[PDB]
Design a protein around this ligand. Structure first.
Ligand SMILES: NC(=O)c1ccc[n+]([C@@H]2O[C@H](COP(=O)([O-])OP(=O)(O)OC[C@H]3O[C@@H](n4cnc5c(N)ncnc54)[C@H](OP(=O)(O)O)[C@@H]3O)[C@@H](O)[C@H]2O)c1
Ligand code: SF4
Ligand code: SF4
Ligand code: SF4
Ligand SMILES: [Zn+2]
Lengths: 43, 370, 111, 138, 176, 147, 93, 57, 106, 88, 204
């Protein structure tokens, strides 16, 4: 007989976002790397 | 494909008249000489993409004439394949829009996924794309035992696949510079234009069709309808991506709820009988002989249906006599609705802005048939 | 009480005069800007053969409807749309017709 | 890790022939890959598949050199594969000459013809009209 | 059930403003856009080499028209004209005649490929199962005459594909 | 001589290696045309590129329906094409009108406007069958350009 | 199977020899005529006549697999064997 | 306001080429079939035009 | 605060009360015995009684309107234009136009 | 290098978690030749007794009544609340 | 019982069959039809603009949106064309049909000031049917050719057309038009004897 069995476990994205911060967010940290690269560059 | 006669005052477009109908195949007069079962695959070939979202609007319109409710299982096939078209339609609505702009990668990223999508169509119906599958007698052929496990396996892998687009196209400075603030239409004038698809739904107006008017086993399936703030192309883009995200939930709930039983309509006076059944009994073979050559003998009158397309509305208007031939039917596809807006959408916008308008509205040139 | 389309009896004929006046001045524009094709003189003769077919004036409604139709098929070449000599060629040149005769049509094959 | 991948490539070249074997496969076919062979086919076609490899892995259906009289060595298309494409190449699971053979009918042709093209023995239309006869005799 | 799209300005003061200002002074989102394409390069290309590898198909597939016959010879088609009436393109032309020996069969049987939208109604409307759609693609021609199939002469050449047809029809009876 | 005959093979091989198309949309066929770009049935594996280049292009692939409005539009494009040119009719509409053969507005299958070299038969012309629009075309290039 | 014409072109399932004065013969000059090797008329007589014990027997191809509507054939006549409308299969007694 | 009622015979404005004057219409109700003994094709008028030349292609 | 459409994101109370009091005077010029005057008055006064009862309430704005308070005012803005068009061209009071030929059944 | 062990670290590093669910993703649980021959179930018909078409009307009630020549068409479409799964 | 569809909202929707009829013009109403929870009203051609201003921004009936503007061509009646204005309410969630009637060549009052979408569908009717519309801005041919004769839908002329065959003949650039030969359409005489339906047959 032709029938369907529900295999539900990981249904998918039910309004879910995988957009996560990676490799360290900026704010003040990447500016310290940026100006830090300049100060190490000039010296 | 499109003529698009431009009147450029200097740099900005003032009068954009889309001289469309360059693909008038003549579906209007040609169906008049065909029966209802014979005229079925014409409405597949109405739009380029929709196959189970198309014919769905036609088969339910024939069902409204015949006063026949399709079997419980067949309706669950109609949603499972109705949403997999809603997945398929919004692939082209994003990718060819990106192709018209100049984005090279995101087109190819979804087309490998799309070629895996047509594997579901192939295993369920002989044709690759245009499948004469959704019929006036509900659903023609049953799902094979192999497919139901593969639908879940695909949706499990689709989760990261849809996340690829939001980690690529939405967060871009280029897109938020380009698509933002092109033809901001939120006004009650848009109701008078009557787009109904993604223009009204994706900006301001809460109204849709799926929630207000159930067609095939709705309210039982959970929905999240995305509604934007501004009438620009970018809000119309994001709601489509959120529609793509809120479609797997419908597919997963369809996988959870599958009542085992009959596929075609129980009455053999409308649905053609099974091959093992027709070769033995007399009544079945006559009904098999008469449902072909002759149509159904439909009740006279006029029906109207509009099941929510990702592009807009397939407003089927069948006018019927006692005979098996439908004398004039008209499907007013979203093409005529969206191309009417271009007189307002282009005012005070550049040449490259017009390219963005056509894609986000998804003006498929097949829509202009009626 | 009744629709009149645009004009009543007499003024409809003056609209044809207005249509003939406008279309007579547009045949130099359909040669220099468009394409030479045939001739300026033969282009004006192409107008005369079109209006000789419409010798059956009987209603104001029929005349006015032909004027509105004439303000589109001949308005197409004023504000130039895509034709490129393949379209907007009213006179048949590719096919040779058989003359109306009892001896000529029976010899070739008709009715 | 990099040494293990390099050893797998060297073993792949040693599997299918060698210096002359792998070079013949690289020039004729798009990519050379080693796997289990089915072998049995009319006009010696290899059809070495069975490998897991990737998506839709009924891999490497190598065309026979001169199937009927075309000398397909430098140029060959999908004109080959006599009644085995439905199982070993596309849809079914079982191998056509190994597990499940097609049933004999004594009507189907033993030798499979090539693709109909601009060459002689090409398709042509005809009508079954007997025509209305005309009677004239002295 | 009412979702929303707009966030309505997430930036407020100092920490939430400067990081949003960072992706405009420098790029970062360009590097984030680079990241997704970088991972996409390293994963294996899903490509099929056409003359050697073949794309996945179904047991019931429509593409090539060929008329089947019984195991003990004998043309299976009956000339009902049933398949003619269902045909939405009106492609299939049929003239019927008695074969002078009682049996009622075919004389003219042209299914032109200039027409036909490969709908597979004639496959499903045939009571005798004569026309079964063979899974074939190998029929690209130079001329119209070479393309449109003649009165059974090129269709009974579909006997060369009948080894697949007899195997693929085993999914048709008791549907899939 | 033998040297001239082998040189003519190299000129034929130059086209047999690479063919750059101007693919006409205006069809449901156009999606199956876009499935050539799709990685599963790769066509950039050949010398074929989706850069189009309308003036430069060699082999125009007419996909699907040709109406009377688009009938003079496609003809003027074909005249602007370089002399080594081929036409691939893709889909049943482009062959002889699959549907809409008996319709008023559709030209009955390309050949009445523009001469067709290779016919692709299928409505949805499957990416399997569409690779006979390239490989069978490449096979058909013999030409026998003697003098 | 079928007898070859004096003109050249082979006859089909029905007696279809092209006339000497007919111009429609240029089509088969250069390219070959597609004529089927197996002729259906000779294959009817090739299949042996099966024997029936009972009065009325039902004909089938092979159940639901092979396409055949179930037709019952009367076998009261001694001379000329009874045959179904679909197959060329004959029945006796 | 403004009626301008004129009584005259009907004329063809949106008409094709010279073929209307030559072809003759036969507005006659279709007769019931000899084998089929049912009256449903009847009781409705049908305007079928006279058939011209037909030949095998 | 933020309105859905292009209508201004502001809630002007009593401005709705001005518009509904104005249209009642517009209806009482030419139609008096006509049903158009009879049916519109019993809906507008029903709404006016509920507006006067509850000031600046979200439940009061939801009373047979659905959306925002500005959207409800927009649903009554062109109602004054509909009433003015009914006064200029009036089919509500007279009935004299010709009946059609007896054929509508398909 | 073509070794999967080192490459899987790179694709996981460059934006988002990967590893599982590949681009090809047709390795395991892909059933060829579908299944062993199944039996399709019958609906509310097929089983004999009380299977009259008098009860199963289908196309019977279809005749349109001609009507006449404050009331609403329906109770007004009340707006639905925001989604519990995601607010924005 | 399994297989048919059930109706309950018919009586609630039938109230509009009284409501719009109680406005009572001979200028508007004429005949009201209601079946399977859908309303069909056929309105005299002289009033179309004042009819469509009603049901728009009206407190009881708020439609605002026009989805379809279909036209029915029928040769049985003296009034040949039955233009159907299909309206859809988004506030009340209901559909209504505003039918009209026009003969061979008479202008109807076009709904350009009422609806901004109407003009595109209005051009479509003038192409397919040839029904001219008064007070219309820029009436152009969209679906038809720029040199097309007659009107593409009209049941007067055949399915194949008249200028169907287009050659690239002896003239270098000019595409031929006036040739009228085509492959024959097999018009199957399919119409089943015996009337299948009661409550539809009319006495002569
Ligand atoms: N206006 C005039 O020029 C003019 C004036 C007076 C009379 N005519 C007459 O009218 C005719 C007009 O023709 P044309 O001059 O326009 O032709 P053309 O342009 O010179 O072309 C001749 C073609 O015929 C083929 N051909 C010629 N001789 C051949 C041979 N011996 N073997 C094989 N193929 C051959 C060639 O094909 P290959 O390249 O493949 O061999 C070539 O493509 C002439 O024959 C001439 O006598 C012309
Ligand atoms: S193919 Fe089948 S339906 Fe068609 S005539 Fe032959 S037996 Fe009849
Ligand atoms: S597949 Fe469809 S269109 Fe093609 S011949 Fe069969 S019935 Fe006709
Ligand atoms: S052949 Fe089929 S898919 Fe291609 S354009 Fe025609 S109908 Fe569309
Ligand atoms: Zn038998």
């Amino acid at each position: 007989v032709k029938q369907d069995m529900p295999p539900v476990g990981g249904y998918g994205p039910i309004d879910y976002k995988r957009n996560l911060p990676r490799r360290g967010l900026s704010g003040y940290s990447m500016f310290a790397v940026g100006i830090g690269a300049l100060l190490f560059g000039y010296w | 494909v499109l003529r698009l006669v431009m009147e450029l005052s200097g740099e900005m477009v003032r009068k954009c008249d889309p001289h469309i109908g360059l693909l008038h195949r003549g579906t209007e007069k040609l169906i008049e000489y065909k029966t209802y079962l014979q005229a079925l695959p014409y409405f597949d070939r109405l739009d380029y993409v929709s196959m189970m979202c198309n014919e769905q609007a036609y088969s339910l319109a024939v069902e409204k004439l015949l006063n026949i409710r399709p079997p419980p299982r067949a309706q669950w096939i109609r949603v499972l394949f109705g949403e997999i078209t809603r997945l398929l339609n919004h692939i082209m609505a994003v990718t060819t829009h990106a192709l018209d702009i100049g984005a090279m990668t995101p087109f190819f990223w979804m087309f490998e996924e799309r070629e895996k999508m047509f594997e579901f169509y192939e295993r369920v119906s002989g044709a690759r794309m245009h499948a004469a599958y959704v019929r006036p007698g509900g659903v023609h052929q049953d799902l094979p035992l192999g497919l139901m496990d593969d639908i879940y396996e695909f949706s499990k892998n689709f989760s990261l696949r849809i996340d690829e687009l939001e980690e690529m196209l939405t967060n871009n400075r280029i897109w938020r510079n380009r698509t933002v603030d092109i033809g901001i239409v939120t006004a009650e004038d848009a109701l008078n234009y009557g787009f109904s698809g993604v223009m009204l739904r994706g900006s301001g107006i809460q109204w849709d069709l799926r929630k207000t008017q159930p067609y095939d086993v709705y309210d039982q399936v959970e929905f999240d309808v995305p509604i934007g703030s501004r009438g620009d192309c970018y809000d119309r883009y994001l709601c489509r991506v959120e529609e793509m995200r809120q479609s797997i939930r419908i597919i997963s709930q369809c996988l959870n709820k599958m009542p085992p039983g009959e596929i075609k309509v129980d009455d053999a006076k409308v649905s053609p009988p099974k091959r093992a059944e027709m070769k033995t009994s007399m009544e079945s073979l006559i009904h098999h002989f008469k449902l072909y050559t002759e149509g159904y003998q439909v009740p006279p009158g006029a029906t109207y249906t509009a099941i929510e397309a990702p592009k807009g509305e397939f407003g089927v208007y069948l006018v019927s006599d006692g005979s098996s031939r439908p004398y004039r039917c008209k499907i007013k596809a979203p093409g005529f609705a969206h191309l009417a807006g271009l007189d307002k959408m282009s005012k005070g916008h550049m040449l490259a802005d017009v390219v963005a308008i056509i894609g986000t509205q998804d003006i498929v040139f097949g829509e202009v048939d009626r | 009480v009744k629709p009149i389309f645009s004009r009543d009896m007499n003024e409809a004929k003056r609209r044809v005069r207005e249509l003939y006046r406008a279309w007579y001045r547009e045949v130099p524009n359909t040669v220099h800007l468009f394409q030479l094709d045939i001739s300026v003189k033969q282009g004006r003769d192409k107008v005369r053969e079109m209006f000789k077919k419409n010798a059956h004036i009987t209603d104001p409604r029929v005349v006015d409807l032909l004027v509105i139709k004439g303000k589109m098929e001949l308005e197409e070449t004023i504000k130039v749309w895509k034709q490129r000599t393949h379209v907007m060629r009213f006179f048949h040149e590719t096919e040779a017709p058989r003359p109306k005769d009892f001896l000529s049509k029976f010899y070739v094959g008709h009715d | 890790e990099l040494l293990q991948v390099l050893k797998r490539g060297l073993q792949q070249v040693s599997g299918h022939g060698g210096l002359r074997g792998y070079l013949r496969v690289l020039f004729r076919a798009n990519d050379v890959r080693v796997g289990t062979l089915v072998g049995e086919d009319k006009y010696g076609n290899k059809y070495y598949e069975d490998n897991k490899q990737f998506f839709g892995r009924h891999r490497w259906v190598i065309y026979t050199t001169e199937m009927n009289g075309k000398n397909t060595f430098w140029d060959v298309d999908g004109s080959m594969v006599p009644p085995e494409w439905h199982r070993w190449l596309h849809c079914m699971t079982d191998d056509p000459p190994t597990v499940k053979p097609p049933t004999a009918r004594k009507f189907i042709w033993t030798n499979h013809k090539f693709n109909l093209s601009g060459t002689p023995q090409q398709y042509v239309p005809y009508s079954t009209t007997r025509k209305k006869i005309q009677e004239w005799v002295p | 059930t009412y979702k929303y799209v707009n966030l309505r300005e997430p930036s407020m003061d100092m920490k939430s403003v400067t990081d949003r200002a960072a992706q405009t002074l420098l790029w970062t989102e360009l590097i984030r856009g680079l990241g997704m394409t970088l991972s996409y390069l390293f994963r294996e290309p899903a490509t099929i080499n056409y003359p050697f590898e073949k794309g996945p198909l179904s047991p019931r597939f429509r593409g090539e028209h060929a008329l089947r016959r019984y195991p003990s010879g004998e043309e299976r088609c009956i000339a009902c004209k049933l398949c003619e009436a269902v045909c939405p393109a009106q492609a299939i032309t049929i003239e019927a005649e008695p074969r002078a020996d009682g049996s009622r069969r075919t004389t003219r049987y042209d299914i032109d490929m200039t027409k036909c939208i490969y709908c597979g109604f004639c496959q499903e409307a045939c009571p005798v199962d004569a026309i079964v759609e063979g899974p074939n693609f190998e029929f690209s021609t130079e001329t119209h005459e070479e393309l449109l199939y003649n009165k059974e002469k090129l269709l009974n050449n579909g006997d060369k594909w009948e080894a697949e047809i007899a195997a693929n029809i085993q999914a048709d009876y008791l549907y899939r | 001589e033998y040297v001239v005959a082998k040189l003519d093979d190299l000129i034929n091989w130059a086209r047999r290696s690479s063919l750059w198309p101007m693919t006409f949309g205006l069809a449901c066929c156009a999606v199956e045309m876009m499935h050539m770009a799709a990685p599963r049935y790769d066509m950039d594996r050949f010398g074929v590129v989706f850069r189009a280049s309308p003036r430069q292009s060699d082999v125009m692939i007419v996909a699907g329906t040709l109406t009377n409005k688009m009938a003079p539009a496609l003809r003027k494009v074909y005249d602007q094409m370089p002399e080594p040119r081929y036409v691939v009719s893709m889909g049943s509409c482009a062959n002889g009108g699959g549907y809409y053969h008996y319709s008023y507005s559709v030209v009955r299958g390309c050949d009445r406007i523009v001469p067709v070299d290779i016919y692709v038969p299928g409505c949805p012309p499957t990416a399997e069958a569409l690779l006979y629009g390239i490989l069978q075309l490449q096979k058909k290039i013999k030409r026998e350009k003697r003098l | 199977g079928v007898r070859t014409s004096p003109t050249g072109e082979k006859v089909t399932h029905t007696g279809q020899v092209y006339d000497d004065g007919d111009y429609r013969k240029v089509r088969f000059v250069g390219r070959q005529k597609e004529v089927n090797e197996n002729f259906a008329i000779d294959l009817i007589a090739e299949q042996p006549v099966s024997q029936v014990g009972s009065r009325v027997i039902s004909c089938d191809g092979g159940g639901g697999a092979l396409g055949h509507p179930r037709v019952y054939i009367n076998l009261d006549k001694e001379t000329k064997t009874g045959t179904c409308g679909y197959c060329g299969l004959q029945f006796r007694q | 306001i403004t009626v301008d009622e004129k009584l005259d015979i009907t004329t063809i404005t949106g008409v094709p080429e010279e073929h209307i004057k030559t072809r003759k219409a036969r507005i006659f109700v279709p007769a019931r079939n000899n084998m089929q003994s049912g009256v449903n094709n009847t009781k409705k008028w049908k305007m079928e035009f006279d058939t011209r030349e037909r030949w095998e292609n | 605060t933020g309105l859905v459409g292009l209508a201004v994101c502001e809630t002007p109370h009593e401005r709705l009360k001005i518009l509904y009091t104005k249209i009642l005077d517009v209806l009482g010029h030419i139609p008096k015995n006509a049903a158009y005057r009879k049916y519109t008055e019993q809906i507008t006064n029903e709404k006016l009684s509920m507006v006067k009862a509850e000031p600046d309430v979200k439940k009061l704005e939801e009373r047979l309107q659905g959306g925002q308070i500005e959207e409800v005012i927009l649903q009554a803005e062109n109602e004054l234009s509909l009433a003015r068009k009914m006064i200029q061209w009036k089919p509500w009071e007279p009935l004299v136009e010709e009946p059609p030929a007896s054929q509508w059944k398909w | 290098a073509s070794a999967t062990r080192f490459i899987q670290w790179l694709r996981n590093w460059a934006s988002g978690r990967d590893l599982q669910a590949k681009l090809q993703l047709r390795y395991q649980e892909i059933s060829k030749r579908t299944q062993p021959p199944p039996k399709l179930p019958v609906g509310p018909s097929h089983k004999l007794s009380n299977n009259y078409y008098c009860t199963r009307d289908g196309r019977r009630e279809a005749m349109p009544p001609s009507i006449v020549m404050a009331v609403s068409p329906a109770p007004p479409i009340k707006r639905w609340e925001l989604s519990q799964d995601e607010p924005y | 019982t399994v297989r048919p569809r059930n109706d309950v909202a018919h009586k609630q929707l039938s109230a509009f069959g009284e409501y719009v009829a109680e406005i009572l013009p001979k200028y508007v109403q004429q005949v009201q039809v209601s079946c399977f929870n859908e309303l069909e009203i056929c309105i005299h051609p002289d009033g179309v603009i004042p009819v469509l201003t009603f049901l728009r921004d009206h407190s009881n009936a708020q439609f605002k949106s026009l989805a379809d503007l279909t036209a029915v061509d029928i040769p049985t009646r003296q009034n040949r064309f039955e233009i159907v204005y299909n309206l859809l309410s988004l506030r009340f969630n209901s559909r209504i049909r505003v039918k009209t009637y026009t003969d061979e060549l008479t202008p109807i009052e076009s709904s350009v000031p009422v609806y901004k979408a109407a003009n595109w569908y209005e051009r479509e009717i003038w192409d397919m049917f040839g029904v001219f519309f008064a007070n219309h801005p820029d009436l152009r041919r969209i679906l038809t050719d720029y040199g097309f004769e007659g009107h593409p839908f009209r049941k007067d002329f055949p399915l194949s057309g008249y200028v169907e065959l287009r050659y690239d003949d002896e003239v270098k650039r000019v595409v031929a038009e006036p040739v009228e030969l085509a492959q024959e359409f097999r018009k199957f005489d399919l119409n089943s004897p015996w009337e299948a339906f009661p409550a539809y047959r009319q006495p002569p």
